[PDB]
Amino acid sequence: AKWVCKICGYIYDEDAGDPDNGISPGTKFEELPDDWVCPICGAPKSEFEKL
Ligand SMILES: [Fe+3]
Protein backbone atom coordinates (compact mmCIF):
# COMPACT_ATOMS: atom_id res chain seq x y z
CA ALA A 1 0.00 0.00 0.00
CA LYS A 2 0.84 3.64 -0.44
CA TRP A 3 0.12 6.40 1.96
CA VAL A 4 0.29 10.11 1.18
CA CYS A 5 1.54 12.80 3.47
CA LYS A 6 -1.37 15.24 3.49
CA ILE A 7 1.05 18.03 4.26
CA CYS A 8 3.61 17.79 1.46
CA GLY A 9 2.50 15.14 -1.02
CA TYR A 10 5.23 12.63 -0.23
CA ILE A 11 4.07 9.10 -0.85
CA TYR A 12 5.14 6.38 1.58
CA ASP A 13 5.25 3.29 -0.52
CA GLU A 14 5.39 0.22 1.62
CA ASP A 15 7.20 -1.60 -1.17
CA ALA A 16 10.00 0.99 -1.11
CA GLY A 17 10.14 1.64 2.62
CA ASP A 18 12.36 4.47 3.73
CA PRO A 19 15.79 2.88 3.98
CA ASP A 20 17.62 6.14 4.44
CA ASN A 21 15.60 6.50 7.62
CA GLY A 22 16.00 2.98 8.88
CA ILE A 23 12.94 1.52 7.16
CA SER A 24 13.53 -1.45 4.91
CA PRO A 25 11.31 -2.15 1.93
CA GLY A 26 8.10 -4.00 2.63
CA THR A 27 7.53 -2.24 5.92
CA LYS A 28 3.86 -1.55 6.46
CA PHE A 29 2.91 1.94 7.41
CA GLU A 30 1.37 0.61 10.62
CA GLU A 31 4.75 -1.00 11.42
CA LEU A 32 6.65 2.25 11.22
CA PRO A 33 8.10 3.35 14.54
CA ASP A 34 5.85 5.82 16.32
CA ASP A 35 8.64 8.37 16.03
CA TRP A 36 8.83 8.04 12.23
CA VAL A 37 7.97 11.16 10.36
CA CYS A 38 7.55 12.24 6.81
CA PRO A 39 11.11 12.37 5.46
CA ILE A 40 10.28 15.47 3.42
CA CYS A 41 8.25 17.75 5.68
CA GLY A 42 8.56 16.12 9.10
CA ALA A 43 4.88 15.45 9.54
CA PRO A 44 3.92 12.81 12.09
CA LYS A 45 2.19 9.66 11.02
CA SER A 46 -1.16 11.13 11.95
CA GLU A 47 -0.91 13.27 8.84
CA PHE A 48 -0.79 10.42 6.39
CA GLU A 49 -3.71 8.96 4.56
CA LYS A 50 -3.86 5.58 2.92
CA LEU A 51 -4.53 5.69 -0.77
FE1 LIG B 1 5.24 15.34 4.31
- To one decimal, the resolution in angstroms is 1.8
How far does the centroid of ligand 1 lie from the alpha carbon of residue 42, in Å?
6
The CATH number of the structural domain formed by 1-51 is 2.20.28.10
CB neighbour class for 31 (10 Å; exposed up to 12, middle 13-18, buried from 19): exposed
List the determination method. Answer: neutron
Assess contact for 12 and 18: CB atoms under 8 A: yes
Give the C-alpha separation, 20 to 51, whole Å.
23
How far does the centroid of ligand 1 lie from the alpha carbon of residue 35, in Å?
14
Breaks (C-N over 2.5 A) in the chain follow: none
How far does the centroid of ligand 1 lie from the alpha carbon of residue 39, in Å?
7
How far does the centroid of ligand 1 lie from the alpha carbon of residue 7, in Å?
5
Q: Is 48 helix (H, G, I), strand (E, B) or coil?
A: strand
